[PDB]
Structure 1
Amino acid sequence: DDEINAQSVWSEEISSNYPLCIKNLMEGLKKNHHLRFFGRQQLSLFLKGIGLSADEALKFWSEAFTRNGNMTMEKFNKEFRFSFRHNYGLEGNRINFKPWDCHTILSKPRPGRGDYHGCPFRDWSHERLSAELRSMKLTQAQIISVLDSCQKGEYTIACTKVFEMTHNIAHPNLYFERSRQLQK
């Protein structure tokens, strides 16, 4: 809990290790104080995978959903608490939901307006990707190479390129673990 907790998953240190899908989900959560079902699952199971405990997850999700009076804690408890507890087996279900790999993520229904699940390398325009990658300090040649992979439908190669270019078989939690090791 010292390293990964409801607070540190918002830190720059820990979030600098997130792949683009998780960054997108965290941004949608921060902006909207809510995520629709598929994004809730993609992000909550990723965070479980990096070691966010059940207690810290319930702190994280209830704080994020109730921010700015978006909903009362009563509403969170009546409409969402069970769903997050279920993801951690706290209601006795005896199914240990695993984090989604990239194939599972890509195989879910493609995101529409208001959805943040999926894979940005597939789901964003080249203009939106280039803007994000510029913000991550990549150069034009680097971005062209990433977009080359996206154009070919090779989304996990695009993501691997972004990893290589921002640092010194396909799974968001592997991206996180590899990146986190390079801080350590």
Structure 2
Amino acid sequence: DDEINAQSVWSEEISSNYPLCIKNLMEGLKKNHHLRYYGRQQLSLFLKGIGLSADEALKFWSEAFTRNGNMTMEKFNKEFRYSFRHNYGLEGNRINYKPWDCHTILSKPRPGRGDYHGCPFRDWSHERLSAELRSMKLTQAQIISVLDSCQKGEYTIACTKVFEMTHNIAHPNLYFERSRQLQK
């Protein structure tokens, strides 16, 4: 828990390593104090994969869902705690919940209104992406190249370009591990 814990996953240092899909999910969670089912699975299994323990996950999710008075601790416990415990096997299930790879993510139903799951390289407008990429200090030529991949449907190539441009088998957890190792 020294490195990855319920508090450090909200740090700039740790979150700087998240790919765009995980950034989007974290932002939706931060703003709305909730995620719908598919996003609740994509993010929770990603965080399990980077080493967030069962206890730290329950802290993370309960604090995020109850933040800013969004719901009571009792409503979280009655309506969501089981679901997060289930993802960790804490009620004894033996289902093989592994983090979702990019192909799995892309194959989930496309996000509609109020959804944050999926792959932003596919799901965001080019204007939405460009603004997101300018905030990551990419220049126009860089953005044009990323968007060219997106228009071709090559979402994981777009994501790989973003990784290369922001640093000095496609899987969000690999992006994270690859990025985090470059901080060490």
Q: TM-score by structure 2 length?
A: 0.99
CA distance in 2, matches of 1:69, 1:47: 24
Whole-angstrom distance in 2 between the partners of 1:180 and 1:96: 26
Q: Distance in 1 between matches of 2:57 and 2:169?
A: 26
Q: Which runs of 5+ in 2 are unaligned?
A: none
Distance 2:68 2:3 in 1: 27
Give the CA deviation at 1:95: 2.1
Supply the RMSD in Å over aligned alpha carbons: 0.4
CA distance in 2, matches of 1:22, 1:109: 17
Deviation at residue 169 of structure 1 after TM alignment = 1.1
> What does the per-residue CA deviation read over 1:15-70, in whole Å, with 9 as the maximum and x for residues that have no partner?
00000000000000000000000000000000000000000000000000000110
Contact 1:5 1:56 in 2 (8 A): yes
TM-score if structure 1 supplies the norm length? 0.99
> Is the 1:45–1:97 contact (alpha carbons within 8 Å) kept by the matching residues of 2?
yes
What is the percentage of aligned positions where both structures have the same residue? 98
> Where in structure 1 do 4 or more consecutive aligned residues deviate above 2 Å?
none
Q: Deviations over 1:87-116 (max 9, x none)?
A: 000000022410000000000000001000
Distance between the aligned counterparts of 1:100 and 1:24, measured in 2? 15
Q: Distance in 1 between matches of 2:94 and 2:103?
A: 24
Unmatched 5+ stretches in structure 1: none
What are the within-5 Å matches in structure 2 for residues 120-159 of structure 1? Answer: 120-159=120-159
Q: How many residues align?
A: 184
Quote the Cα distance in structure 1 between the aligned partners of 2:169 and 2:98: 15
User: Corresponding residue for 1:74?
Assistant: 74
- How far apart are the structure 2 equivalents of 1:133 and 1:68? 29
Contact in 2 for aligned 1:62/1:76 (Cα 8 Å): yes
